[PDB]
Symmetry: D2
Subunit: 263 residues, 4 copies
Amino acid sequence: EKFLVIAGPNAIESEELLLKVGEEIKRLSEKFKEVEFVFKSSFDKANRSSIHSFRGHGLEYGVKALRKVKEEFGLKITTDIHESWQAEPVAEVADIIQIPAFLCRQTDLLLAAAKTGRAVNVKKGQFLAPWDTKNVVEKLKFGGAKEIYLTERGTTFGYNNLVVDFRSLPIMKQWAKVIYDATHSVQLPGGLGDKSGGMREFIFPLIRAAVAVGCDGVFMETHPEPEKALSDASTQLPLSQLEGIIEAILEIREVASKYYETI
Amino acid sequence: KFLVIAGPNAIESEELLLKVGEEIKRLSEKFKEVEFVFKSSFDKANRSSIHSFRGHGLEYGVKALRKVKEEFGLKITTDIHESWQAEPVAEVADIIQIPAFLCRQTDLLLAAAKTGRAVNVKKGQFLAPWDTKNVVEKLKFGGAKEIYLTERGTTFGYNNLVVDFRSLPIMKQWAKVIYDATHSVQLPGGLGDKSGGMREFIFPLIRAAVAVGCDGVFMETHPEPEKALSDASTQLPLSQLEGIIEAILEIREVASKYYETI
Amino acid sequence: EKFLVIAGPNAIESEELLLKVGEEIKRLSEKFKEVEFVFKSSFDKANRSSIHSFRGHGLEYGVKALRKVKEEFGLKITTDIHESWQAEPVAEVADIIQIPAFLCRQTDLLLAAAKTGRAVNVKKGQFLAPWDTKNVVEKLKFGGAKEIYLTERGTTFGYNNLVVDFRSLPIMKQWAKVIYDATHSVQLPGGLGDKSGGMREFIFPLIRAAVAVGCDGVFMETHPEPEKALSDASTQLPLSQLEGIIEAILEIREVASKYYETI
Amino acid sequence: KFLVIAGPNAIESEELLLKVGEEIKRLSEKFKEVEFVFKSSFDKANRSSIHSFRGHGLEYGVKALRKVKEEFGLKITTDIHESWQAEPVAEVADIIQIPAFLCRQTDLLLAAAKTGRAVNVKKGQFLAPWDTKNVVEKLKFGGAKEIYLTERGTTFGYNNLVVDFRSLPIMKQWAKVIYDATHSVQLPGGLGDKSGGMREFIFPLIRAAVAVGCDGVFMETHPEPEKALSDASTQLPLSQLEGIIEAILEIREVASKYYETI
Ligand SMILES: O=P(O)(O)OC[C@H]1O[C@@H](O)[C@H](O)[C@@H]1O
Ligand SMILES: O=P(O)(O)OC[C@H]1O[C@@H](O)[C@H](O)[C@@H]1O
Ligand SMILES: O=P(O)(O)OC[C@H]1O[C@@H](O)[C@H](O)[C@@H]1O
Ligand SMILES: O=P(O)(O)OC[C@H]1O[C@@H](O)[C@H](O)[C@@H]1O
C-alpha cells in the first residue's frame, strides 16, 4: 500500500511560511512517488500551556492559507479542530480532519468530523491504552467516517515526560490505519515551565523504530528554522533534513516489510 | 470553611437530583461547619463508548439543577465541554467545572472565567502538579477570582490512576485545592466499554486527603450506585455519605494543626 | 495494638552517632509508652549509585555498634542484610532483619533471614505491585518466619521519581503487618546524578496520609544534622523534629482509628 | 561484530542445553557475521513463588555449560546472584551476567569484574537510562574492560514493562548495548504466582531495536516454550530463531547507515 507522510509547520505562522514549506513538500512528492504526502499545519494552538504563547491567526485566515497551499501545490491538506462547529468550515479545505490528543474522547468533536465525509485522524491521548482506541474508532464509524487513522504520539510516563510503547502499533492496527507522530513523541510536556520541551536527537532513531515495527505512515512537523518557531520549537525538524529522513524510512520499510505481521 | 462537593455523577432525572439533594440538604443543616455544593453533569461528553449514557441535554440539565437550588437552597456546580455552554450554565452554576481532559483548552477556561462564576478545574491525568500554575494564570487573565484545582489521579501505566498526595501542597501555592475521592479510584476503560474502579479505597484515600490538607472534597453519590447510568463503580451509596463526612471533619480538626503554611 | 516506630540514622557512620541518636529515641520511648520503638541503622550501604559514595565500616563494626545501643538503651534493633551469609551474625543483635527493596525477590536472602527466628521486614521493591507481595510473605512463612512486615517505600513513577500509592497499605495488610517508610518515599532515585535526591518538605504530609489510611507502624530515618549525613542527606529528618512528628501521627492515628477498615 | 546471546532461560537439564546448543551452533556456522554466545541460568534466584523451578545448582549448571562450550565450541554467559559465585562461574562463563534487580549491588559487580571476564548488566526496571553511567563506572573501578548494558524494559504501572528505545543511544555513550527481546515483553507477576508476557510483540520490538541501533540482541529460546519450567510466556520456539536472526541482520544492514555517532 502507499505510505503516508503527514508533514508541515506546527502552526500557520503566516501564509508565507506555509508556501515555503509546501514548495519543499511538493518537490519531495515528485521524487518520492510511492509516498502520499499530506500537508499539515494548525490554524490554532488551542491547548498551549501558557496564556502568553502563540495560538494563531484564526480559523478564517488559517483555512485561506491552507487552501492556498492545496491550490498552488496540489497537495492534500490536514489540520486539527478544537470544537464541533469548526468541523464544517475546515472540511472545505481539509482532506483529513485531525482530532487533538487531549480531545480524543470528546464524542461531539469526533461526530462533527465524521459527518463531513472527510478522513479522520485521531491523536491517541497520552492517557489512553492502545486497546482503549477501539472505542474511539467505533464512535467514528457510528458517525459516518469511512477512512480512519490513529496516531501514536507518546504516553504519560511520570511527570513532564512521554514514552513510546511501540506495542501500540500492531495493537491499534487491528481497527485502524496507524500513523506515528515522530515529533510530538519526543516532547517533554511542560518541560520548560511555561512551555513544553523536547529532545530532537531522538526523533530519527524512534522514527526508524516505528517503520521497522510497521505503520501506515508517519507524521513529522518541520520548519525552515525550528529555533524560531512560534510553537514546538524543540521538536520541529529542520526542513533541510526532511528529504533524508523520508528516504531512510522508505529504505527501512522496504527491508522490514516482508516481516510485518498480518493483523 | 471546608467545601464538600457532592451529588450524582450524571443528571439521570431531576427526580434523582431531588432525592440526593434532599439528603445533601439534611447534611447541610447538620454540618454548619461545611459548605455544601451540589454537583451533577448535564452531559457526559467523554464516555468511552458511543452507546453509553450521556444525558438529557443542557436545557433539561440546567432546569433540573435550578430546581435543586430553588427547592433546597444549595449552591450548584456542573461541568462544561465547549465554550458556548459557559454562559447558559452560569445562570445556575455557582461553580463552573472544567473536565480533566479539557483542563488545557484555553477557550473553555476563558469562557468559564468570563461568566464571573467560580471555576474548578479537574487536573488532567497527564498533568504534573506544578503544571497547574499555568492553568490558574489563564483563569486570572480571564477574570476569574475564585479558582479551585481538583486532584483526581494521574495516569499510572494503562487503565490505572495513582494519587500523588504531594500534589495537594504543591497546588495549594496558587489555588484552593479539592480532592476528588470518587474518580481518583476509577480504572480508566478498565471494563472494556466503560471505566472501572475500586470503591473499597474511596474512604481510606479521602482520610489521607484531609490528613495531608485540602480545602475541600468532591464525592459523587447515588442512592443505588449499582444502578447508576454512569461511574457506577465509583459512586458512593447515599446512605454512607454522612458517616464519611463526619469522619473527615474529625480527622481534619486534629490534623489541621499540622498543615504546613503556604 | 502497639504502634511501631522504626527510626535511627540511615548508616552507622560511627558508634558515637548511634549512641547520640539512641539517647533521643530512648527518651522518646519513655514518653510515648504506647509506641514500640526499634532502632535502625545500616552497617553497609551495598547499593549506592556511585562507587565513590560512603558504604560503611563493615559488618563486624556495625553489629558491635548496634549491640552497644541495645545494651546501653535497652532498645530493640533492626538492620538490613545484603547476602545470605550475613543473616546469622546479624541475627545475634537484630530483633528485626530488614530485606532491602532491590532484594525483596531474592529467595535465598529471604530464606536466610527467616530461619534465624528473628522478625523480618521486607522493603517493597519499587518494581512490585501491592498484590505481588503476597508471594513474598509466602516465601518467608515457608522459611520459618513468624513475624513478618512489609514496608511501603514508593514505586517507580517515570524516571528518577517515586510515587506512593496509598492503596498498597490496605492491600498488603491482607497478608502482613504494614510499615510506611516516610523518608525513602520522598527520595528521587539518582536525582543528583551520582547520588539520589529527595524532597524533605513532603515527609510530614505523607506520613500523616499513611496514618490516616492506617498502618502498623512508620519507618523514619533521622540524623542530628541531615546536611552532613554520609548517605541519604536529602531525606533524613532532623533529630529535633522526631518528637513532634511522632506526637502528630499518634494524634491522627487515634482520631482516625475508629474508621480503619477490617481486612 | 553483531552479538547474539541466545539459549534456554534455565538449565532444566544438560540434555536441553545440548539440543538448543546444537541449533545455535548450526546458526553460528551459517551466520559468520554474528558472534553467538550461549546463555542459560544455573539458578532462578528471583522467582515470584517459592514453589517455582529454580534449577539444579551451580555445580550441575557449570558442568552442563562446560559441556556446551566443549561440544559446540560456543562462548558462554550465565548470571550470578551472590558475590561468591563469580569465581566458580568465571571458569566457564565468557560473559558474567548481572541480574536486573541486582544491577546496583556493588559487591556483585566488583566480584564479576575481578574475574577478568566480560560483564553484561541487565538494566534494572527501576533505573533511568542515564543512571547506568554509574554502573559502568563501578565495573571499570573493579577492573572490567568489556562491559555491556542490556535493555530489558522499565516499570510502567503495575505488572507491565515498557521499552523506552531512547535508552539505546543514551547507554551507548558508556557501554556496548544489548537488547533483551525476551524479557522486554514479560508482564511481571502477571500470572499471579508467575510472570506473564506477550510473545506476539517479541519480533516487532526486536526489529525496532536494530533499526534504532544496538550492539547485540539477547533472546531466550526453547524447543517447546509451552513446557518450559521458567519464562514459558516469553521464550521463543527454537524453530523460529533462524528466521528472526536473518531478519534483524537484513534490517541492521540497511538501517546501520543511519546510526548516529557517539
Ligand atoms: O504550550 P506547550 O506546552 O509548549 O505545548 C502545547 C503544544 O503541544 C501540542 O499539543 C501542540 O503542538 C501545542 O503547541
Ligand atoms: O469510560 P467511561 O466509564 O465511559 O467514562 C469515563 C467517566 O470518567 C469521567 O470523565 C466521567 O464521569 C465519565 O463518565
Ligand atoms: O547512592 P544513592 O543513589 O544516594 O542512594 C542509594 C540509597 O537509597 C537507599 O537504598 C539507601 O539508603 C542508599 O544509601
Ligand atoms: O515471576 P517469575 O515468572 O517467577 O520470575 C520472573 C522471571 O523474570 C526473570 O527475572 C527470570 O527469568 C525469572 O524466572
